[PDB]
Write a protein that binds this DNA or RNA. Structure first.
Lengths: 129, 123, 205, 150, 80, 82
RNA sequence: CCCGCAGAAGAAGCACCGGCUAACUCCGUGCCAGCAGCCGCGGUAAUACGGAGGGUGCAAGCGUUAAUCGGAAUUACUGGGCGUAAAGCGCACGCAGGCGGUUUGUUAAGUCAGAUGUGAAAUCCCCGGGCUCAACCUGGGAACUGCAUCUGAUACUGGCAA
RNA sequence: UAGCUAGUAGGUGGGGUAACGGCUCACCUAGGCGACGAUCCCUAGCUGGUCUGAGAGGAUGACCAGCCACACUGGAACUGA
């Protein structure tokens, strides 16, 4: 059954980048809009738009720089089978800083740079490389 | 492989037991050499290989190769077995230390002299 | 614990002048350099990758007169120090007392400098140091004692100090026969042809 | 400034009508010493013809690598056939410390001081192919910032 | 304040005493998975008010029998 | 009895004594409550040779601790400053 | 520890040299004698056996043996696999277990941040100091990745209510 | 090696100890532990640490230091803080 909708979202974006898809729709939630706002903020997607009233639908307009795709490798880190909670010192950098890692901290859903600057660790959701 | 399956039952690599039950895993043992033989090797090789059969000090009766050209072993001749397989003979797992208790150094040898129990010739 | 053999043979296996017989005359002229390191020395080796790494380590040890456990300890110390491990390793080999006595022109070779150091003819900072591998700190004064001053060797050695290149990190002065190790030698200040990445990679396998 | 070096020569066989026929395969890598790495295979009946075909194929089919100062940028994993390969920039982690047949491509590639560890198969014909794939899909901070805006 | 624990009654039938299962939720040292893990405790109660299936807080005291170094403070959540 | 006493720790023919506070029936180089200074009888003729925390020593003598003859000699050496 | 005396005078072995693996020829032997960690050498011109010359590596040591970890991603948590190489239960139902769509409120158990107590000393690491240097000894720090308690944060997971 | 346990699990009262306590005894209740591995069997002193490892780990716990246990073998108490 669906047991990880975040990894489902990242799957939608990997398979949309891999199929030269212009835009990606999915069911929407607060955590997916938080992550999507981080991705737009860090420049991996072009835009997002949440529509619907009773059944919201998140839509990510994807990016393609050259013919190549911008989101090179998006991975889900803290899956439901095994959750990964890092401190502010254990908090990893991806592609030696060239690629953010979306961590859910108590202050909100941030990146690794932003939460290492904020001085607080948390639950590391996904590597975007 | 699923992490739940490893919590239920962890990984386990086997023990990989010893080639040489020289017991306690001691570097050498001593034995009495119950008899002395020559034995024909396995198929691609042919020779007569000089091999003793030894009652060790820990009880085990093991057969043991005798290195070098010519020995002086005969049936009681307390030797010092070493450890090391001769692959060409089926079932010898050990060697005798030449230049040890009742096993003289190899006669007229000049190179690789330490591993055959031979002293330096005075010159 | 040191080599004690044919020196120019070691300089002939490496293919390069290792400065092992600096002494009186000029460039070798009786070495048959390059030609035959043994009986089959006329053969080109077609050397391996292990052979080039090994042969680089042997070049450096046979220059500075160090054996393997001592060299290996220099590699461990150069590894743990902050910075560049090749450059740190040459900085540890260049701070050796017998080397600093060689660089100042007090000995003709590094073995003669090692015998000056060994035979209590050398003080550092006004204290006699008997040890070939004493590690000379920066801003030190290393000199010859009153015994073994004005002995022939050192004079002749200073005579052949002017034929060489006068290292930048020293105060060579031969009037008083005292020297000042001022700073650590930069990598660009020494020899230019030893490949220390090969010996880093040799010990890191 | 071409900096060519051969990795592996082998004797392959064919088994015709009357006995066998033995051919030799080279495998070389050239590179300038600042990006610009190529490999070539080349096979012929004698060894110098094999290496010459290998060099001649390797001088063309040469790929750009976005080096750092003297080294890689981020840790990169390249895979080819059965041969999985890791690399780590080792920001002046002195000396090229790579496996055989990876030391050579990283040596003429112009990189100086990375850390490697090949996994899986370590056939030399596929461990390069897994270093270039690898160094090819390693991108620089002026390329990532080009992609994602800033 | 005092250090106390919470747990549920696992069985009831003993003469002015009870036994309480505690659920600590601990990460596996090798595998990094948060795993439930119990701790059954023989707990004292004067006049045995708590029955089976309850939830009760519990503090540590002096020994009162063999094992039994624990005594309740507050019975909550008895709902059948 | 707790004793402020020396405990030999240097090499052979080169002792370095660490002054500790031990239960007196322990071994010399054994179990101590706290170490409180040191005493090097050589060290060189440089700067110290001996430093020794007088506040903690005064604490333990306030508790009832005894002091061996060397530690008393060292406190009589480092009196307040010298 | 310092000074003086006499004279190079008292002071170099061990393994290896077919590939892996740095370092090659001659002679003796001829499926023998024997070697060998694996591949394997030896049945007449053996760079693999035994000797010599030569060289290579280490050096007051050097080899062999035993044992451990590494290499071994060949138990894979980091970090593997399962159509045909070993590997999908013959197929289902289902308890305990593991996991669980979406919104709001509360809690704050997990999680995170800070503080305090503790985590003995030595050892490892860093910056210094003393033995002529080094090993060694030593000063100060870092570390001891932990546990407990208190103070907070509430995004995610859990509890509770809708 | 899937069942183990009758002072066994708990209670009341008496005794006992420096001190709580089935520690012990009388009576009452019929519990307690166990697949989160009891019980049985083989092995083993434990730790700070040591060796290896890039690390996570793996092996080990000689010297040095902390704790425990033993003092020919089996048992017992006496003196004493």
């Amino acid at each position: 059954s669906m047991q990880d909708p975040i990894a489902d979202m990242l799957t939608r974006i990997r398979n949309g980048q891999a199929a030269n898809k212009a835009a990606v729709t999915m069911p929407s939630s607060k955590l997916k809009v938080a992550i999507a706002n981080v991705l737009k903020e860090e420049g991996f997607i072009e835009d997002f738009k949440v529509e619907g009233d009773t059944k919201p639908e998140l839509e990510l307009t994807l990016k393609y720089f050259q013919g190549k795709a911008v989101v090179e490798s998006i991975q889900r880190v803290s899956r439901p089978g095994l959750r990964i909670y890092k401190r502010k010192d254990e908090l990893p950098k991806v592609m030696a800083g060239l690629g953010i890692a979306v961590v859910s901290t108590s202050k909100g859903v941030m990146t690794d740079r932003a939460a290492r600057q904020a001085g607080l660790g948390g639950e590391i959701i996904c590597y975007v490389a | 492989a699923t992490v739940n399956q490893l919590v239920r039952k962890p990984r386990a690599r086997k023990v990989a037991k010893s080639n040489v039950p020289a017991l306690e895993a001691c570097p050498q043992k001593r034995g009495v050499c119950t008899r002395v033989y020559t034995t024909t090797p396995k198929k691609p090789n042919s020779a007569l290989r000089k091999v003793c059969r030894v009652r060790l000090t820990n009880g085990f009766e093991v057969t043991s190769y005798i290195g070098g050209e010519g020995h002086n072993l005969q049936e009681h001749s307390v030797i010092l077995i070493r450890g090391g397989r001769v692959k060409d003979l089926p079932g010898v797992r050990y060697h005798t230390v030449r230049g040890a208790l009742d096993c003289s150094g190899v006669k007229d040898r000049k190179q690789a002299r330490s591993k055959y129990g031979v002293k330096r010739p005075k010159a | 614990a040191r080599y004690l053999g044919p020196k120019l043979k070691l300089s002939r296996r490496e293919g390069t002048d290792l400065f092992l017989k600096s002494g009186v005359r000029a460039i070798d002229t009786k070495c048959k350099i390059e030609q035959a390191p043994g009986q089959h020395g006329a053969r080109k080796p077609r050397l391996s990758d292990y052979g080039v790494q090994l042969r680089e380590k042997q070049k450096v040890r046979r220059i500075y007169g160090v054996l393997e456990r001592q060299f290996r300890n220099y590699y461990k110390e150069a590894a743990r120090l902050k910075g560049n491990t090749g450059e740190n390793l040459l900085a540890l080999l260049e701070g050796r007392l017998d080397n600093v006595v060689y660089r100042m022109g007090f000995g003709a070779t590094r073995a003669e400098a090692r015998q000056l150091v060994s035979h209590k003819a050398i003080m550092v900072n006004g204290r006699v140091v008997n040890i070939a591998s004493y590690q000379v700190s920066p801003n030190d004064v290393v000199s010859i004692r009153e015994k073994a001053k004005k002995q022939s060797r050192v004079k002749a050695a200073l005579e052949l100090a002017e034929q060489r290149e006068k290292p930048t990190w020293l105060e060579v002065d031969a009037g008083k026969m005292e020297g000042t190790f001022k700073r650590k030698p930069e990598r660009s200040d020494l020899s230019a042809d030893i490949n220390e990445h090969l010996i880093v990679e040799l010990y890191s396998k | 400034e071409l900096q060519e070096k051969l990795i592996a020569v082998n004797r392959v066989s064919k088994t015709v009508k009357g006995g066998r026929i033995f051919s030799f395969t080279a495998l070389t890598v050239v590179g300038d010493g600042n990006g610009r790495v190529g490999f070539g295979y080349g096979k012929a009946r004698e060894v110098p013809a094999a290496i010459q075909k290998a060099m001649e194929k390797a001088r063309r089919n040469m790929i750009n690598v976005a080096l750092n100062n003297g080294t890689l940028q981020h840790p990169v994993k390249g895979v080819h056939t059965g041969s999985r390969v890791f690399m780590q920039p080792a920001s002046e982690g002195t000396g090229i410390i790579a496996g055989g047949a990876m030391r050579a491509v990283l040596e003429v590639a112009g990189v100086h001081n990375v850390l490697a560890k090949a996994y899986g198969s370590t056939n030399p014909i596929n461990v390069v192919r897994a270093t270039i794939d690898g160094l090819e899909n390693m991108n620089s901070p002026e390329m990532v910032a080009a992609k994602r805006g800033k | 304040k005092i250090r106390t624990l919470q747990g549920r009654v696992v069985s009831d039938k003993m003469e002015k005493s009870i036994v309480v299962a505690i659920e600590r939720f601990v990460k596996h040292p090798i595998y990094g998975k948060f795993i439930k893990r119990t701790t059954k405790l023989h707990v004292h109660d004067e006049n045995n008010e708590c029955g089976i299936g309850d939830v009760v807080e519990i503090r540590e005291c002096r020994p009162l029998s063999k094992t039994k170094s624990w005594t309740l403070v507050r019975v909550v959540e008895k709902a059948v | 009895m707790v004793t402020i006493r020396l405990a030999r720790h240097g090499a052979k023919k080169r002792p370095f004594y660490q002054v500790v506070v031990a239960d007196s029936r322990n071994a010399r180089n054994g179990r101590f409550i706290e170490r409180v200074g040191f005493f090097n009888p050589i060290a060189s003729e440089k700067e110290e040779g001996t430093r020794l925390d007088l506040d903690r020593i005064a604490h333990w003598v306030g508790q009832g601790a005894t002091i061996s003859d060397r530690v008393a000699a060292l406190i009589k050496e480092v009196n307040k400053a010298a």
